[PDB]
RNA sequence: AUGGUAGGAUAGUGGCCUACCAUGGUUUCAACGGGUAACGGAGAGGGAGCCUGAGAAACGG
RNA sequence: AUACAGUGAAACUGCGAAGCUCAUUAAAUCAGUUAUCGUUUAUUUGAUAGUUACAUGGUAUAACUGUGGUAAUUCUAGAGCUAAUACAUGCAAUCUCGACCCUUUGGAAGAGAUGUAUUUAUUAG
C-alpha cells in the first residue's frame, strides 16, 4: 500500500486527526515506519516553519535541512531516535527524543552535541575479508569496532567521520532510556536483567523517584551513567 | 646492472626466486631417479658456489628453496658430493646458519634433522669421514643454545634423535665429544626413554667423576618420585646401578636404591629386610646423598594405595630421617638436612595430607605427628607442639583425628578449634585445615556429625589465620560453589563459617593474623569480589538449589557489617530485598527457611 | 544404525580412513541451551538423527512446554497430552480441557507412556510435528 | 490418512510431491456433521496451457 | 562554436504500469501474539571490489530516403542509410619475516606472500 489514513497513522506524531484525508507515509530509510518522523511533519506540524507540503518541498530543495550532517531532500525521509537535525540558515541543532507522554519532543542542542549521536549496538559480526563490524539501531554499519563492544551496548558516533569515539557497556547501574511499551520516554537506572533464553529478556529499571518498572530489553537504550548522561535531556 | 634499472633488477630477482624453486621442485620429484653425475659440477659451480658466502646471513628466518636443496643432498647418500665440493663449503654454509644467533627454530629443525641423516648414512669415502667430523663438532658445541631457542616438542625430539645417533656411531669415545654431549643433555633437563637410553649408554661405556655426575645424581634421584611406569622406573635403576660403578661412593647407594625398587612385582621379602636393615643401625650410617634417593622411593611407597606393609616401613622410614636429624652434634650438620627436609618432605607431606585416601592420609598424619614430638632442631612446628601438650594421648589429637572410633575423632576437632588462637597462622593453613576439611565434604553418614563439628572448628581456625591464606582459602571455596554442584551445600555453609571471622576482625579493628592496618583495602576486596560473586549466586534462578544457597545471605550480611557504614547502607538493601524476594515465594517450607535466616540475621 | 537404503551420516563430518587416529568415528554434537544438559548417550552414541536437538540440524527456539506422554508407538515421535482449566464467565466456572501435541523425540531419550516430558519449539519437522523432546522425567 | 528414511519441487521448512517401511492420528474433555440478523471471498464471454516483473499465476499479452 | 555545443518532432534505450459485478462463508475468515538459526526482497540509508587503451567492431538497425501489394487494420515486402549507459569485445603494484644490528625512529641483504561469484570435498572456528 502507498496511502496512509490520518486516523490509521500511529499515535506518536501528535498529528491532529481532522486536518486532512491522508498523512505522510514515511519512506524507506534508517528507521522503521512506526518509530520515524518524516521531515514534513517535523517542519510543518511541530516547528510550524512551513504551512503546507509545497512550502516544505521548497525548504528541502533549498538544501537548508541536514539529517545527521547530510542534506536530505525527501519530504518523507524517516528521521528517528537519536537523529540530529541541523538548520544552518537559522543556526539550530535539534535532537529527536521521546517525551514522557511518548511523543517526539523537539529538543534544541549545542553544536558540539549536534556533532555526534548515540547508537544502540544491534549486532556485531565479522564481515568479508575478516573485517569486524557493528550494526546499530539506525542501520549504520561501522567497521573495525573496539573489541569490547558487544550487543546491547551504546556507541557514541561522530557524524562527520562516522567513527566510534567511545562506548558504554550494558550493565546494572547504567542510565537508560525506554524506547517502547507504556514506559516509552522514561529514564532510569538498571537494577537487574532477567534472562529468558529463547524468549524476550526483561530489564528492571528504577527512576530517580525510586519507582521501579519492568520492560523488554528491545525497548532499552543505554544513554550514560547514573547522573552523567552523554546527551542533553529534556 | 646498477641501481637505476630497478625494473630489470626486480624481474631478475623473480627469475632467481622462481628458478631456485624450480631446482628445489625437480630434485624432490626426480632426484633419485635421474643421474646427475654429469651435471653435478655444473650445478654447484653456477648455482651453489656464488651464494655460499652469504648463505648463513640470508636464510635465518625460514627455509628457502636454496636451503632445501642442501637439505635434500644431505639426506640422499648419492648426492653427498655436492656437500664435498670446495672443502665442504656447502656443509660449512649449513653450519654457519646454525652458528648464527638470529637463526630461528623453523630453520634449525630441518638442518638438525638433515645432520642426523648424514650421521645415520655411512658412506665409503675419505670426504665423508671429514664431513661428519665437521658437522659433529659444530653441533655439539652449539646444541645447548639451540634447545633454548626451540619452542616445539617435536623440535626437542629431533634433537634427541640426533643426539642418540651420536652415541650409536661412536663420537662419544672422544672425551671432548663426551663432555659437550653431556652439556647438551643437562640443558635439555634444565622422549624421556630416549633420554634415559642416551644417559645409560654414555655413562655405561666410560667413567665419570663424582663432581661431574653429582648434579645429575640429584635430579635423576628426584626423578624416582616423579616416574611411575615400570619401564620408566626400571630404566632409571640401571643408571643408578651404572652411576655406582662409576664412583665407588655411590655404589653402596645404587645397590640400596636397586633393592628399594624391584621389578615386575616388588620383592617383598628382600625389601622388607632392607627396611629392617636401615631401621637397625643402617640409618645412622647412610649419608645425605644416600638419603636423597631413599626418600624419593619412600615417598613413592607411602603414596602407593595397594600395599600396607611397604607404607608403614616407608612412613617409619621417614621417621628415621627425623631421628637422623636429631643425631647431629649441632645445628650446622642438621641445617643441611633441615633444608633438605624442607625442600622435599614438607611439600609432599602437604599434598599427602590433601590425599583423598584415608589410610594414605593417616600415615602422613603420623609422620607429621612424629616431627612435632621430636623438635630438637626443627622449630617450625613448635606451635602445633603446644597444641599437643607434650604429645599426651587424647591431647596430642594426632591419634584422635584418626582413631578407629568416630566419637574420639569428633572430640578432637572441637578441642582443636578452641585452642586455635595459640597456634601459628602458617601451620593452621598448610596442615590442619587440609587434614580436617575433607570431613566436611565426606559423603559417608558416619562422618556427618564429624563434618558439622569440623565446620565450627575451621571457622575458629579461620579467625586465627593469616590474611593472605584466608583470602586464598575463601576464593577456592567460591570456586567450589560454581565448579562443584555436589559440594555446594558444604561450601556455602563453610563460606558462612569463613564470613564470621572476617566480620569479627573488621569489628575489632574499627583475629586474623597480619591483618592490614588500613580498612579500605579489605573493604574494596569485599566490594568487588566477595559481594558481586556471592550476590549473583544468591540471585540465580535455580529452584533445585535455592534452599542450599539461602545461607549465602548470612555470609553477605557478615561481610557487609565488616564494611564501612556508607558501604553498609549501599549493600544491605540488595541482600535483604533478595531475601524478601525468596520470602515472597509461594512454598511454605521455603518461606520458613527464609524466616529462620532472617531471624539469624536480625 | 545403517538400517535404511541410504547411508546415515552427519553432514559435513568427515572421518579420514587413511589417518585412522581413533577407532571411534568423529561425532558432532551441540548443547541446545536453556540449561538443558546434553545427555552423554548423545555425545558417545552411534545414532544418526537429523532432527535431534543435540546432534541434528534443528534449533530450539520459542515456547518451551511440558506434557504427559500418551503415545509412543510411532518411530522417533510421540504424542503428549496437556490439560488445563478454561474459565467460562457466563457462569463464572472452570471446565477441564486437554490438547494432544505430537512431538519429535531423539533416540538419545527413552520415553514410556505416562512420564513427564519438557519439549521445545523448533522448525516444522513434519506436517504436525513442531516440537522436540528436550528433557525427560 | 499418522510418522520414519532417501529423493523431486520449492526464497525456502514441511508428505508440498515421489520410492520403501510401521498402522497409525482426533474424539463423550464433544472429533465429524447440521442450522444461523456468521455483510454480521471470487471472475472480467466459458473452461486449458504459457509469457514479464523485486513484487501477479496480472481487469496485460 | 569546423566534431557538436541553445531548443527540439520522430525513433532506439531507462523507470513505472501491482472502481464495479456475483458468491457466501463459525476461531480454515479475521484480530492479537511468537519464530523464521527455514525464508525472497525493486527502492531508501550506510558500508563494500589496487590483482587499440590519447579508447575495438557491426559481428546494426530504428527513426529517415526511395519502389510497390492489398477492400482493408496499431496490414505489408524490396532496395539504400546513420548513433548509444542498446548489442558483442576488451587493458614497471602492495604487504610481511626481516640479518647487516650498518644507524640504535631509522634504513636495509635475502627469503616470502598477495581478487571476487557458483558447486563439491576437507581443515580451523
PDB file of C-alpha atoms in Angstrom, chain A residues 37-220:
ATOM      1  CA  UNK A  37       9.428  11.249  11.989  1.00  0.00           C
ATOM      2  CA  UNK A  38       9.274  12.306   8.314  1.00  0.00           C
ATOM      3  CA  UNK A  39      10.737  15.737   7.708  1.00  0.00           C
ATOM      4  CA  UNK A  40       7.373  17.133   6.584  1.00  0.00           C
ATOM      5  CA  UNK A  41       5.704  16.651   9.979  1.00  0.00           C
ATOM      6  CA  UNK A  42       8.805  17.836  11.852  1.00  0.00           C
ATOM      7  CA  UNK A  43       8.995  21.025   9.779  1.00  0.00           C
ATOM      8  CA  UNK A  44       5.248  21.768   9.490  1.00  0.00           C
ATOM      9  CA  UNK A  45       3.259  20.277  12.378  1.00  0.00           C
ATOM     10  CA  UNK A  46       5.912  20.636  15.118  1.00  0.00           C
ATOM     11  CA  UNK A  47       8.128  23.604  14.207  1.00  0.00           C
ATOM     12  CA  UNK A  48       5.442  25.331  12.070  1.00  0.00           C
ATOM     13  CA  UNK A  49       8.247  26.727   9.889  1.00  0.00           C
ATOM     14  CA  UNK A  50       6.188  25.568   6.889  1.00  0.00           C
ATOM     15  CA  UNK A  51       2.435  25.879   6.387  1.00  0.00           C
ATOM     16  CA  UNK A  52       1.945  23.277   3.629  1.00  0.00           C
ATOM     17  CA  UNK A  53       3.764  20.418   1.948  1.00  0.00           C
ATOM     18  CA  UNK A  54       4.745  22.580  -1.023  1.00  0.00           C
ATOM     19  CA  UNK A  55       6.475  25.057   1.283  1.00  0.00           C
ATOM     20  CA  UNK A  56       8.261  22.082   2.844  1.00  0.00           C
ATOM     21  CA  UNK A  57       9.359  20.985  -0.628  1.00  0.00           C
ATOM     22  CA  UNK A  58      10.765  24.457  -1.308  1.00  0.00           C
ATOM     23  CA  UNK A  59      12.607  24.245   2.022  1.00  0.00           C
ATOM     24  CA  UNK A  60      14.141  20.875   1.149  1.00  0.00           C
ATOM     25  CA  UNK A  61      15.168  21.922  -2.366  1.00  0.00           C
ATOM     26  CA  UNK A  62      16.891  24.903  -0.740  1.00  0.00           C
ATOM     27  CA  UNK A  63      19.102  22.278   0.981  1.00  0.00           C
ATOM     28  CA  UNK A  64      18.738  24.067   4.329  1.00  0.00           C
ATOM     29  CA  UNK A  65      17.969  20.884   6.322  1.00  0.00           C
ATOM     30  CA  UNK A  66      20.623  18.314   7.255  1.00  0.00           C
ATOM     31  CA  UNK A  67      19.896  14.969   8.929  1.00  0.00           C
ATOM     32  CA  UNK A  68      22.907  13.572  10.801  1.00  0.00           C
ATOM     33  CA  UNK A  69      25.098  16.065   8.951  1.00  0.00           C
ATOM     34  CA  UNK A  70      23.841  15.098   5.472  1.00  0.00           C
ATOM     35  CA  UNK A  71      21.471  17.144   3.319  1.00  0.00           C
ATOM     36  CA  UNK A  72      18.148  15.381   2.704  1.00  0.00           C
ATOM     37  CA  UNK A  73      15.694  16.463   0.002  1.00  0.00           C
ATOM     38  CA  UNK A  74      12.980  13.824   0.573  1.00  0.00           C
ATOM     39  CA  UNK A  75       9.891  15.217   2.299  1.00  0.00           C
ATOM     40  CA  UNK A  76       9.085  11.841   3.901  1.00  0.00           C
ATOM     41  CA  UNK A  77      12.646  10.994   4.963  1.00  0.00           C
ATOM     42  CA  UNK A  78      12.256   8.866   8.141  1.00  0.00           C
ATOM     43  CA  UNK A  79      14.138  10.690  10.873  1.00  0.00           C
ATOM     44  CA  UNK A  80      14.100   8.820  14.163  1.00  0.00           C
ATOM     45  CA  UNK A  81      15.504   8.264  17.635  1.00  0.00           C
ATOM     46  CA  UNK A  82      18.907   9.892  18.245  1.00  0.00           C
ATOM     47  CA  UNK A  83      18.826  11.744  14.908  1.00  0.00           C
ATOM     48  CA  UNK A  84      20.406  15.201  14.648  1.00  0.00           C
ATOM     49  CA  UNK A  85      18.554  17.754  12.507  1.00  0.00           C
ATOM     50  CA  UNK A  86      20.707  20.782  11.669  1.00  0.00           C
ATOM     51  CA  UNK A  87      19.350  24.023  10.197  1.00  0.00           C
ATOM     52  CA  UNK A  88      22.311  26.243   9.340  1.00  0.00           C
ATOM     53  CA  UNK A  89      20.356  29.151   7.844  1.00  0.00           C
ATOM     54  CA  UNK A  90      18.809  29.791  11.275  1.00  0.00           C
ATOM     55  CA  UNK A  91      21.547  28.177  13.444  1.00  0.00           C
ATOM     56  CA  UNK A  92      19.602  25.411  15.202  1.00  0.00           C
ATOM     57  CA  UNK A  93      20.525  21.844  16.086  1.00  0.00           C
ATOM     58  CA  UNK A  94      17.743  19.512  17.218  1.00  0.00           C
ATOM     59  CA  UNK A  95      17.787  16.020  18.721  1.00  0.00           C
ATOM     60  CA  UNK A  96      14.757  13.743  18.418  1.00  0.00           C
ATOM     61  CA  UNK A  97      13.808  12.161  21.761  1.00  0.00           C
ATOM     62  CA  UNK A  98      10.599  10.627  23.067  1.00  0.00           C
ATOM     63  CA  UNK A  99       8.853  12.576  25.799  1.00  0.00           C
ATOM     64  CA  UNK A 100       7.211  11.098  28.885  1.00  0.00           C
ATOM     65  CA  UNK A 101       3.901  11.254  27.009  1.00  0.00           C
ATOM     66  CA  UNK A 102       5.575   9.197  24.270  1.00  0.00           C
ATOM     67  CA  UNK A 103       5.667  11.836  21.519  1.00  0.00           C
ATOM     68  CA  UNK A 104       8.808  13.045  19.813  1.00  0.00           C
ATOM     69  CA  UNK A 105       9.829  16.290  21.523  1.00  0.00           C
ATOM     70  CA  UNK A 106      11.832  18.932  19.662  1.00  0.00           C
ATOM     71  CA  UNK A 107      14.936  19.453  21.825  1.00  0.00           C
ATOM     72  CA  UNK A 108      17.440  22.191  20.997  1.00  0.00           C
ATOM     73  CA  UNK A 109      21.095  21.210  21.418  1.00  0.00           C
ATOM     74  CA  UNK A 110      24.550  22.736  21.102  1.00  0.00           C
ATOM     75  CA  UNK A 111      26.764  22.378  18.041  1.00  0.00           C
ATOM     76  CA  UNK A 112      29.080  20.014  19.929  1.00  0.00           C
ATOM     77  CA  UNK A 113      26.020  17.957  20.865  1.00  0.00           C
ATOM     78  CA  UNK A 114      24.895  18.111  17.233  1.00  0.00           C
ATOM     79  CA  UNK A 115      28.290  16.871  16.037  1.00  0.00           C
ATOM     80  CA  UNK A 116      27.646  13.387  17.481  1.00  0.00           C
ATOM     81  CA  UNK A 117      24.867  10.887  18.124  1.00  0.00           C
ATOM     82  CA  UNK A 118      24.316   7.726  20.173  1.00  0.00           C
ATOM     83  CA  UNK A 119      23.587   4.343  18.606  1.00  0.00           C
ATOM     84  CA  UNK A 120      22.499   1.143  20.331  1.00  0.00           C
ATOM     85  CA  UNK A 121      24.530  -1.836  19.112  1.00  0.00           C
ATOM     86  CA  UNK A 122      22.057  -4.220  17.468  1.00  0.00           C
ATOM     87  CA  UNK A 123      24.578  -6.693  16.048  1.00  0.00           C
ATOM     88  CA  UNK A 124      28.337  -7.367  15.977  1.00  0.00           C
ATOM     89  CA  UNK A 125      29.835  -9.712  13.397  1.00  0.00           C
ATOM     90  CA  UNK A 126      32.767 -10.434  11.105  1.00  0.00           C
ATOM     91  CA  UNK A 127      32.387  -9.277   7.507  1.00  0.00           C
ATOM     92  CA  UNK A 128      34.140 -10.321   4.334  1.00  0.00           C
ATOM     93  CA  UNK A 129      37.950 -10.439   4.443  1.00  0.00           C
ATOM     94  CA  UNK A 130      37.688 -10.941   8.211  1.00  0.00           C
ATOM     95  CA  UNK A 131      36.719  -7.327   8.948  1.00  0.00           C
ATOM     96  CA  UNK A 132      34.666  -6.987  12.165  1.00  0.00           C
ATOM     97  CA  UNK A 133      31.817  -4.502  12.134  1.00  0.00           C
ATOM     98  CA  UNK A 134      28.799  -3.370  14.134  1.00  0.00           C
ATOM     99  CA  UNK A 135      25.200  -2.668  13.098  1.00  0.00           C
ATOM    100  CA  UNK A 136      23.431  -0.063  15.239  1.00  0.00           C
ATOM    101  CA  UNK A 137      19.758   0.770  15.764  1.00  0.00           C
ATOM    102  CA  UNK A 138      19.782   3.239  12.840  1.00  0.00           C
ATOM    103  CA  UNK A 139      21.204   0.654  10.434  1.00  0.00           C
ATOM    104  CA  UNK A 140      24.741   2.059  10.462  1.00  0.00           C
ATOM    105  CA  UNK A 141      27.491  -0.426   9.572  1.00  0.00           C
ATOM    106  CA  UNK A 142      30.722   0.633  11.307  1.00  0.00           C
ATOM    107  CA  UNK A 143      33.852  -1.409  10.608  1.00  0.00           C
ATOM    108  CA  UNK A 144      36.846  -2.105  12.851  1.00  0.00           C
ATOM    109  CA  UNK A 145      34.957  -1.648  16.147  1.00  0.00           C
ATOM    110  CA  UNK A 146      36.560  -1.784  19.554  1.00  0.00           C
ATOM    111  CA  UNK A 147      36.654  -5.471  20.615  1.00  0.00           C
ATOM    112  CA  UNK A 148      34.956  -4.805  23.963  1.00  0.00           C
ATOM    113  CA  UNK A 149      31.837  -3.552  22.156  1.00  0.00           C
ATOM    114  CA  UNK A 150      29.054  -6.152  22.278  1.00  0.00           C
ATOM    115  CA  UNK A 151      25.324  -6.333  21.608  1.00  0.00           C
ATOM    116  CA  UNK A 152      23.086  -4.055  23.738  1.00  0.00           C
ATOM    117  CA  UNK A 153      25.994  -1.623  24.224  1.00  0.00           C
ATOM    118  CA  UNK A 154      25.714   2.008  23.100  1.00  0.00           C
ATOM    119  CA  UNK A 155      28.345   3.629  20.868  1.00  0.00           C
ATOM    120  CA  UNK A 156      28.946   7.372  20.540  1.00  0.00           C
ATOM    121  CA  UNK A 157      29.303   8.107  16.815  1.00  0.00           C
ATOM    122  CA  UNK A 158      30.840  11.246  15.320  1.00  0.00           C
ATOM    123  CA  UNK A 159      28.638  12.380  12.436  1.00  0.00           C
ATOM    124  CA  UNK A 160      31.363  13.997  10.327  1.00  0.00           C
ATOM    125  CA  UNK A 161      33.514  10.851  10.087  1.00  0.00           C
ATOM    126  CA  UNK A 162      31.080   8.167  11.267  1.00  0.00           C
ATOM    127  CA  UNK A 163      33.613   6.599  13.645  1.00  0.00           C
ATOM    128  CA  UNK A 164      33.335   5.317  17.211  1.00  0.00           C
ATOM    129  CA  UNK A 165      34.723   7.760  19.786  1.00  0.00           C
ATOM    130  CA  UNK A 166      33.503   5.987  22.945  1.00  0.00           C
ATOM    131  CA  UNK A 167      31.122   3.274  24.122  1.00  0.00           C
ATOM    132  CA  UNK A 168      29.009   2.257  27.115  1.00  0.00           C
ATOM    133  CA  UNK A 169      28.545  -1.352  28.204  1.00  0.00           C
ATOM    134  CA  UNK A 170      25.135  -2.703  29.192  1.00  0.00           C
ATOM    135  CA  UNK A 171      25.352  -3.309  32.943  1.00  0.00           C
ATOM    136  CA  UNK A 172      23.477  -2.674  36.169  1.00  0.00           C
ATOM    137  CA  UNK A 173      23.543   0.925  37.362  1.00  0.00           C
ATOM    138  CA  UNK A 174      23.706   2.350  33.834  1.00  0.00           C
ATOM    139  CA  UNK A 175      21.368   5.158  32.788  1.00  0.00           C
ATOM    140  CA  UNK A 176      18.706   4.016  30.345  1.00  0.00           C
ATOM    141  CA  UNK A 177      16.055   5.437  28.034  1.00  0.00           C
ATOM    142  CA  UNK A 178      12.903   3.451  27.266  1.00  0.00           C
ATOM    143  CA  UNK A 179      12.023   3.395  23.555  1.00  0.00           C
ATOM    144  CA  UNK A 180       8.876   1.245  23.714  1.00  0.00           C
ATOM    145  CA  UNK A 181       5.961  -0.008  25.746  1.00  0.00           C
ATOM    146  CA  UNK A 182       3.996   2.086  28.196  1.00  0.00           C
ATOM    147  CA  UNK A 183       7.219   3.377  29.789  1.00  0.00           C
ATOM    148  CA  UNK A 184       8.348   4.908  26.471  1.00  0.00           C
ATOM    149  CA  UNK A 185      10.288   8.101  27.131  1.00  0.00           C
ATOM    150  CA  UNK A 186      11.011   7.276  30.775  1.00  0.00           C
ATOM    151  CA  UNK A 187      14.587   7.457  32.074  1.00  0.00           C
ATOM    152  CA  UNK A 188      16.059   5.302  34.809  1.00  0.00           C
ATOM    153  CA  UNK A 189      18.972   3.236  36.075  1.00  0.00           C
ATOM    154  CA  UNK A 190      19.214  -0.518  35.521  1.00  0.00           C
ATOM    155  CA  UNK A 191      18.632  -2.720  38.573  1.00  0.00           C
ATOM    156  CA  UNK A 192      18.584  -6.314  37.308  1.00  0.00           C
ATOM    157  CA  UNK A 193      18.407  -8.012  33.909  1.00  0.00           C
ATOM    158  CA  UNK A 194      16.177 -11.090  33.992  1.00  0.00           C
ATOM    159  CA  UNK A 195      17.081 -13.557  31.235  1.00  0.00           C
ATOM    160  CA  UNK A 196      14.776 -15.948  29.415  1.00  0.00           C
ATOM    161  CA  UNK A 197      16.805 -17.773  26.782  1.00  0.00           C
ATOM    162  CA  UNK A 198      14.689 -18.333  23.700  1.00  0.00           C
ATOM    163  CA  UNK A 199      12.409 -15.579  24.991  1.00  0.00           C
ATOM    164  CA  UNK A 200      12.205 -11.844  25.497  1.00  0.00           C
ATOM    165  CA  UNK A 201      14.691 -10.672  28.115  1.00  0.00           C
ATOM    166  CA  UNK A 202      13.253  -8.403  30.812  1.00  0.00           C
ATOM    167  CA  UNK A 203      15.022  -5.473  32.488  1.00  0.00           C
ATOM    168  CA  UNK A 204      14.085  -3.776  35.760  1.00  0.00           C
ATOM    169  CA  UNK A 205      14.628  -0.009  35.878  1.00  0.00           C
ATOM    170  CA  UNK A 206      14.454   2.377  38.846  1.00  0.00           C
ATOM    171  CA  UNK A 207      13.762   6.071  38.298  1.00  0.00           C
ATOM    172  CA  UNK A 208      15.137   8.965  40.339  1.00  0.00           C
ATOM    173  CA  UNK A 209      11.894   8.836  42.356  1.00  0.00           C
ATOM    174  CA  UNK A 210      12.735   5.207  43.382  1.00  0.00           C
ATOM    175  CA  UNK A 211       9.753   3.902  41.366  1.00  0.00           C
ATOM    176  CA  UNK A 212      10.539   0.603  39.630  1.00  0.00           C
ATOM    177  CA  UNK A 213       9.227  -0.800  36.348  1.00  0.00           C
ATOM    178  CA  UNK A 214       9.932  -3.765  34.067  1.00  0.00           C
ATOM    179  CA  UNK A 215      10.405  -3.530  30.301  1.00  0.00           C
ATOM    180  CA  UNK A 216      11.588  -5.748  27.463  1.00  0.00           C
ATOM    181  CA  UNK A 217      15.254  -5.482  26.517  1.00  0.00           C
ATOM    182  CA  UNK A 218      14.376  -4.488  22.943  1.00  0.00           C
ATOM    183  CA  UNK A 219      12.963  -1.201  24.299  1.00  0.00           C
ATOM    184  CA  UNK A 220      16.183  -0.458  26.236  1.00  0.00           C
TER     185      UNK A 220
END
